[PDB]
């Protein structure tokens, strides 16, 4: 009966409060999380009604776990109306790179490659769903806390198979902050390419979303702590573009469910949401390369 949405990384921050807001709207939320105990705990602490959500294990750092999640979701027999790619990792105090179960640098492997496989797999479920209005939302960047800009180069690391000791998409020296930025740029390019390749054929809406500066989540906590040691007058709610976790989740819920956000191939940013189209140019060319190589790394070919 209830429309069904999958949210990755729903045990914390934006994903958790997006699930809360979507449950309030009458949806059934699949909480695709790696830590089943932590997820159940925070779902109870916020009083989620048990008939409105289901917890299924997903570890985006293990490609076979991504396939196992899809198999387990299909066992439920719920038609898939929406997918929110929300989970992300950032390691602000990392000197040397960490590796995924498939020997890919952890940030890109989790934030991008895991989601990339999940989107390509779940595209068949979104197609099979009979609803006219079906949406795939990707949490992205500000425009279409870390001052270093992302730089994919010519994907030399991807072209070489991206296996360790390769640590960056352009095969340069590992930097954990730039690694996060590079992986979030890949999310944005995935949205561009999903729209270009599949919107006309399938009718599915493919958009990215910047919910605002959600300073209270754990993601950038170390940056805020470092700010306080230098500026002791500093609090998180004074950050530029600060939004609460509850409001961020409501904005996710709007982009998933509301009629105002039916256009495909745009980036929603924040107040009543500014829209940015993803047209053509230089990043459209990068997106095509990003897609082709990512298919090889995740075993789709
Ligand atoms: N916070 C901000 O200010 C901004 C955030 N964003 C985007 O919003 C999204 C959420 O960020 P935020 O909510 O702040 O970060 P949080 O750390 O608060 O939530 C991160 C979520 O990702 C999940 N996750 C991490 N690794 C994996 C994995 N390998 N497999 C499955 N789930 C995983 C975590 O699970 P666990 O609970 O087990 O850690 C957690 O639930 C991200 O995509 C981020 O890029 C964009 C702009 C600003």
Q: 């897609």: which residue's tokens?
A: 291
State in Å: Cα 90 to ligand 1 middle. Answer: 8
The residues near 13 (Cβ < 8 Å, ≥ 6 apart) are: 214, 216, 217, 218, 219, 245, 248
- CB of 239 within 6 A of ligand 1: the answer is no
Q: Identify which of 6, 8, 9, 150 to mutate to test ligand 1's pocket (most ligand atoms within 8 A of the CB).
A: 9
For residue 47, what are the contacts with CB-CB under 8 A and spacing of at least 6? none
Name the residue with the closest Cα to ligand 1, atom 17: 219
Domain boundaries of the chain, sorted by first residue: 4-298
> If you search the block for the tokens 């590992």, which residue do you land on?
174
Output b/e per residue, 170-188; b: 16+ Cβ within 10 A. bbeebbbbbbbbbbbbbbb
Looking up tokens 């929603």 gives: 268
For the chain, the helix, strand and coil percentages under 3-state DSSP, each to the nearest 5: 45, 15, 40
Cα dihedral: 157, 158, 161, 163 (round 10): 60
The structure was resolved experimentally with X-ray
Cis peptide bond N-terminal to 160, omega within 30 = no
C-beta of 65 in contact with ligand 1 (< 6 A): no
Spell out the residues 6+ positions from residue 174 whose beta carbon is closer than 8 angstroms to its own: 96, 97, 105, 167, 168
Q: Are 57 and 75 in contact (CB under 8 A)?
A: no
Mutate to test the pocket of ligand 1, among 67, 219, 270 (most ligand atoms within 8 A of CB): 219
Q: 88-111 burial, b for 16+ CB within 10 Å, e for fewer?
A: bbbebeeeebbbbebebbbbbbbb
Distance (angstroms) between ligand 1 centre and the Cα of 130 equals: 30
Fold annotation for 4-298? Rossmann fold (3.40.50)
Nearest CA to ligand 1 atom 9: 86
The resolution, in Å, is 2.2
Protein residue with least CA distance to atom 32, ligand 1 = 9
């Amino acid at each position: 009966m209830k429309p069904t949405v999958i949210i990755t990384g729903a045990s914390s921050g934006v994903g958790l409060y997006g699930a809360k807001a979507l449950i309030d709207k009458g949806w059934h939320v699949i909480m695709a999380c790696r830590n089943l105990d932590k997820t159940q705990k925070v779902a109870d602490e916020l009083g989620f009604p048990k008939d409105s959500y289901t917890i299924i294990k997903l570890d985006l750092g293990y490609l076979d776990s991504v396939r196992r999640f899809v198999a387990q979701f299909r066992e439920l027999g719920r038609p898939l109306k929406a997918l929110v790619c929300n989970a992300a990792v950032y390691f602000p105090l990392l000197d040397e790179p960490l590796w995924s179960a498939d020997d890919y640098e952890l940030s890109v492997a989790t934030n991008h490659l895991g989601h990339f496989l999940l989107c390509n797999l779940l595209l068949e479920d979104l197609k099979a769903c009979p609803d006219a209005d079906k949406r795939l939302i990707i949490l992205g960047t500000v425009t279409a806390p870390i001052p270093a800009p992302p730089d994919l180069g010519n994907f030399e690391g991807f072209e070489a198979g991206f296996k360790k000791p390769i640590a960056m998409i352009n095969n340069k020296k590992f930097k954990s902050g730039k690694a996060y930025k590079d992986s979030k740029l890949c999310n944005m390019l995935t949205t561009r390419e999903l729209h270009r390749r599949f919107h006309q054929e399938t009718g599915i809406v493919f958009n990215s979303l910047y919910p605002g500066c959600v300073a209270d989540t754990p993601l950038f906590r170390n940056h805020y702590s470092l700010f306080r040691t230098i500026f002791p007058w500093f609090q998180k709610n004074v950050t530029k573009g600060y939004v609460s976790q509850e409001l961020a989740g409501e904005r996710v819920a709007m982009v998933v469910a509301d009629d105002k956000f039916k256009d495909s191939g745009v980036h929603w940013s924040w107040e009543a949401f500014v829209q940015e189209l993803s047209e053509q140019g230089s990043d459209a060319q990068k997106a095509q390369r990003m897609w082709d190589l990512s298919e090889k790394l995740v075993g789709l070919v």
